[PDB]
Structures are given as structure tokens and as C-alpha cells.
Design a binder for this molecule. Structure first.
Ligand SMILES: CC(C)(C)NC(=O)[C@@H]1CN(Cc2cccnc2)CCN1C[C@@H](O)C[C@@H](Cc1ccccc1)C(=O)N[C@H]1c2ccccc2C[C@H]1O
Lengths: 99, 99
């Protein structure tokens, strides 16, 4: 589709059988999701945003369905207000930026 | 142009006659530039992101230029490693996400 930027570009993704909202973030390199206990072994990473550095749990080779498109990648899980999907999963669905 | 997300989306902008580089960030409501002086007056503003809140300086009506298109808008200034082009200015140049 052709999504405009007058509002926050939110889409629906599917993580382990649960449907949730997420933000298309081209400034985020990675995908940071909310608090959930995902199946698998995690390892800590400390990422840094606009208001500080956060301690997230890194999960590898996790299956995500972004709008019916089953893709795969790394998802960091930590204390974030909104689910955010970054450039790592976006390239997988072919998402571009036009103007 | 069409821009993909394999490498981070950086464009060459002109603010104050000097050429800078900035990140087209659709996950950012506002536009935040690196600490500098802009030839307008400013008021304080508290924005929030990953980690927490931070205090920035809100300058209004600054004449920026993103890839040929000359825009005028609200630009924030604060502590950041990268210049960020938020949705307020992106809607002004017609940016859209396509997939
Ligand atoms: C992977 C990770 C998430 C840690 N990366 C970032 O947060 C980057 C960091 N860089 C580089 C960087 C900058 C400073 C320190 N470390 C790294 C600058 C840009 N942020 C990208 C932003 O797009 C992230 C969003 C996330 C968000 C959106 C809505 C709700 C909460 C959080 C962001 O912070 N946007 C906020 C935002 C941003 C600008 C202006 C106003 C606002 C309000 C909101 O839109």
C-alpha cells in the first residue's frame, strides 16, 4: 500500500499466535517489542534511544507475520511504550520510502 | 526518489546555508537537530522516546531544504548523535511508506 505520514504509521504484526499493533520506524535499526515472554533463550543488550539507554532481551530467529507476509529476524524485548519495528524486518517485506 | 532500508536512510539537507546529513525517521513525531544555534527564538519542549524524556529547544519557522524541496517548519534542537527528520516535515515533502 501507500501509507501517509499524517498519523503514526502503525500496522499489525503477529508474534507467536498473538496479534498486536506496531510502528513502522525507519530511524530504528532494530525491532523493539513490548513485554512478553517469547519461546527461546535470551541474551542481554543495552540499546540507546532519545531519552536514555534501555536494557533489552535479544531473541534470535523469531517468526513474524507482518500483514500476512511471514518473515524472520531478531527482536529485542524491553520496557518500551510502543512496539516498534525497525529496518531489520522492514527490508524483509520490501518497504521503501518515496517522495 | 525511492529509498530502501538496507543502509540507514540519510539525506543531504541545508539548514543555515551549511550542508548537513539527516536520518529520515518515520517513528519520530517531531524533527530533532544536533545542538546548534538557529536564527529564531525558542521555547522549551519535553519529548519522550526510548529510555525516557528529555528537554529540547523548540525553534519555529526555520527554512530547511530536504533534497531540492524547500520547507519551513518547527524544528527542535537537543542532545542527539544524528539529525532526525520527523513526521512534521515529512508530510510537507510528500513522503510515503510503500509495501
Ligand atoms: C532501536 C532504537 C529504538 C533504540 N533506536 C532509536 O530509538 C533511535 C535512536 N536514534 C539516534 C539516537 C539519539 C539519541 C540517543 N541515542 C541514539 C534516533 C532515533 N531513534 C529512532 C526513533 O525513531 C525512535 C522513536 C521510538 C518511539 C516512537 C513513538 C513512541 C515512543 C518511542 C522515537 O523516540 N520517537 C519519539 C520522538 C523522536 C523525535 C521527536 C519527538 C519524538 C516523540 C516520538 O516520536
Amino acid at each position: 500500500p501507500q501509507i501517509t505520514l499524517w498519523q503514526r504509521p502503525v500496522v499489525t504484526i503477529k508474534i507467536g499466535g498473538q496479534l498486536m499493533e506496531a510502528l513502522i520506524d525507519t530511524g530504528a535499526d532494530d525491532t523493539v517489542l513490548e513485554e512478553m515472554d517469547l519461546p527461546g533463550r535470551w541474551k542481554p543488550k543495552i540499546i540507546g534511544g532519545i531519552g536514555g539507554f534501555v536494557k533489552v532481551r535479544q531473541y534470535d530467529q523469531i517468526p513474524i507475520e507482518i500483514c500476512g507476509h511471514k518473515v524472520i529476524g531478531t527482536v529485542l524485548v524491553g520496557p518500551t511504550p510502543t512496539n516498534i519495528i525497525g529496518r531489520n524486518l522492514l527490508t524483509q517485506i520490501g518497504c521503501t520510502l518515496n517522495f
